[PDB]
Design a protein around this ligand. Structure first.
Ligand code: ZN
Ligand code: ZN
Lengths: 56, 115, 306, 107
DNA sequence: GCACAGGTAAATGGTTTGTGTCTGCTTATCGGTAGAGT
DNA sequence: ACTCTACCGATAAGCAGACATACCTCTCGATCCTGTGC
């Protein structure tokens, strides 16, 4: 993200959410969680069609 | 070929050849002869691994980048408590995670490979 | 609108010369033509209710010469635009005109239906991008630029430079892809066709550092492949012979190659004379970027970058 | 049975099927270094005689084409020297029954 | 007064980001022997 | 003994073909004319 420095391998910068849902999420981990959810949704969307064709 | 031999006349480069009778390798151009002794044992060098201390262009404006992280590593020569560090610029997984520190006072590049 | 009107406005039909020379263009307020022929201002509410089109007529100047204002069509007007009646309307005026003050506009009213143009996402032009092809394919890296003219007509000419041969294969050569030519051409031949005859100048253009021996070693097969061509004329006629299927003699092949290089070879840098140096420098920069990608000194370009 | 060392020519292969009614089999030392039938995934293969094959076909009321097929170039078929039309009995262990017998016909 | 019937248009040049995974056909390329001498 | 060239087999490598879960709901457009006739 533009808010981090170059060559930063710390867990916070690489997508570790040290907070909880009750506590709340910082913008960076919020963006990371959104990316993970988008990846999951895309995975299910492809998988349902693939398994349907395989079942047929 | 670590270096390329260019013909003094014209601007083409020189092919490798052997004098046979003189038993001495000579470089010759094609547009013009330009025969010389060609006193260089190097005919071809092949490289298979990344060069040690590749670093980068390290321009004098390397300290003007706001995205470069800063540390407090001691400078070996000028003994400064400020520098900027970055990893190797090789674009594969074979390179290690060593850090190259560049001092903005004396422009000296020193690594953290204590080993 | 004015740029398109003035782009190609003069046409000559054949001391008998006929010219059109279209003049300035302006856009009037939205009006509607009734059955009896009368005209009146067309408001968005009336257009929506009567299933009409919220379009405004536009006129151009002819200025016919052999050696006034004329109607050209109707252009739909986006709501709440500079030509819309609601741009300067206040809250009271909007209420009087039976228009919701909370409406934001930005849509076209055609045939009484509201239409919104969805933004289309496309890759940026005039950008050099390098990607690595599949392992089974004989191509290792491709460097292509989608050159196009901004103010001029849409061209979209793609010049692709590919590195033939895999890393294991010793037949490492670079061949470009000129438009309308159905066979790849060596880079050295193209460089010679631009007037840069000596090989040292070619190497100077390709690489800006004399200590990078790996790049020179990779370029050595290319300069060896460029041995056959030695002057500009032979390169030009070789390029011409690679175009048309020998329909005409080779005398016109040189002219055809020169014209294609002056027009279609990277038609974003320039199109007039004196293009040889700039185009040669751009080609050298592209080759340098491709070799840097090959030398794993840079990462493959990401197509998802915004 | 002929066991060559490294390679054999196509003309040499053509020469082999020319001796009636005898049979000539060619094998490779590399393939014969390790016994295939000793593997844990290879079940027992038993060749059936003509009378046994006829009895099986009559009892199950089946045609020759209505049986599982095994290629003549199969390593087990080459090991047993199966001819065309021969039926081999296969006994394998099962996780639902203690023993299971299956039959395949060489094609 | 208005209708009536053939596909006469573009020639061109030209297009598009990032679809893989087998399938079959058609070449190009690589070894290997047979018609026999001094 | 292998030269002067022929069919045998065994691959590489380019050229196209087929196709992508299932169920329903709603709205919205388009289904021809210009040169030629007396
Ligand atoms: Zn010279
Ligand atoms: Zn220092």
């Amino acid at each position: 993200l533009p808010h981090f420095s170059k060559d930063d391998y710390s867990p916070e910068s690489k997508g570790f959410v040290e907070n909880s849902y009750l506590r709340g999420l910082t913008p960076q981990e919020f963006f990371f969680h959104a990316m993970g959810g988008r990846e999951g949704l895309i995975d299910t969307a492809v998988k349902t069609a693939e398994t349907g064709y395989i079942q047929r | 070929m670590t270096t390329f031999r260019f013909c003094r006349d014209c601007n083409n480069m020189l092919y490798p050849r052997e004098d046979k009778e003189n038993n001495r390798l000579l470089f010759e151009c094609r547009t013009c002869s330009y025969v010389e002794e060609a006193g260089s044992p190097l005919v071809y060098r092949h490289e298979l691994i990344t060069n040690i201390g590749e670093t980068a262009g390290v321009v004098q404006d390397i300290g003007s980048d706001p995205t470069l992280p800063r540390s407090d590593r001691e400078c070996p020569k000028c003994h400064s408590r400020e520098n900027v560090f970055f990893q190797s610029q090789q674009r594969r997984k074979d390179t290690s995670m060593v850090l190259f520190f560049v001092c903005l006072s004396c422009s000296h590049i020193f690594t953290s490979d204590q080993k | 609108l004015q740029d398109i009107i003035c782009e190609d406005s003069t046409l000559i039909l054949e001391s008998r010369k006929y010219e059109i020379s279209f003049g300035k263009i302006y856009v009037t307020k939205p009006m509607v033509n009734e059955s009896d022929g009368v005209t009146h201002a067309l408001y968005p509410q009336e257009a929506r209710l009567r299933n009409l089109t919220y379009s405004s007529g536009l006129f151009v100047d002819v200025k016919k010469r052999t050696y006034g204002k004329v109607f050209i069509g109707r252009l739909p007007i986006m709501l709440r635009s500079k030509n819309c009646y609601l741009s300067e309307a206040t809250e009271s005026d909007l209420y009087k005109l039976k228009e919701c003050p909370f409406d934001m506009g930005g849509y076209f009213i055609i045939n009484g239906s509201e239409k919104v143009l969805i933004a289309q996402e496309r890759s940026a032009g005039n950008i050099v991008q390098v990607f690595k092809k599949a392992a089974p394919s004989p191509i290792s890296h491709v460097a292509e630029i989608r050159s196009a003219l901004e103010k001029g007509s849409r061209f979209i000419s793609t010049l692709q430079v590919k590195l033939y041969g895999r890393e294991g294969s010793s037949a490492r050569t670079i061949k470009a892809t000129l438009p309308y030519i159905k066979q790849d051409i060596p880079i050295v031949i193209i460089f010679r066709a631009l007037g840069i005859i000596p090989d040292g100048e070619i190497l100077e253009h390709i690489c800006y550092d004399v200590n990078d021996w790996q790049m020179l070693e990779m370029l050595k097969p290319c300069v060896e492949d460029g041995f056959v061509i030695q002057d500009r004329e032979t390169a030009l006629d070789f390029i011409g012979r690679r175009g048309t299927a020998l329909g005409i003699k080779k005398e016109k092949r040189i002219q055809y190659a020169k014209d294609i290089l002056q027009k279609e070879f990277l038609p974003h840098i320039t199109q007039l004379e004196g293009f040889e140096s700039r185009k040669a420098f751009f080609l050298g920069y592209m080759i340098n970027r491709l070799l840097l990608c090959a030398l794993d000194r840079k990462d493959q370009d990401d197509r998802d970058h915004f | 049975i002929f066991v060559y060392q490294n390679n054999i020519t196509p003309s040499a292969m053509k020469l082999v099927p020319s001796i009636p009614p005898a049979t000539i089999e060619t094998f490779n030392e590399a393939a014969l270094v390790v016994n295939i039938t000793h593997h844990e995934l290879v079940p027992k293969h038993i060749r059936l005689s003509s009378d046994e094959k006829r009895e099986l076909l009559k009892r199950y009321r089946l045609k020759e084409s209505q049986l599982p097929r095994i290629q003549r170039a199969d390593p087990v078929a080459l090991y047993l020297g199966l001819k065309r039309g021969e039926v081999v009995k296969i006994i394998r262990k099962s996780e639902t029954s203690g023993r299971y017998a299956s039959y395949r016909i060489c094609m």
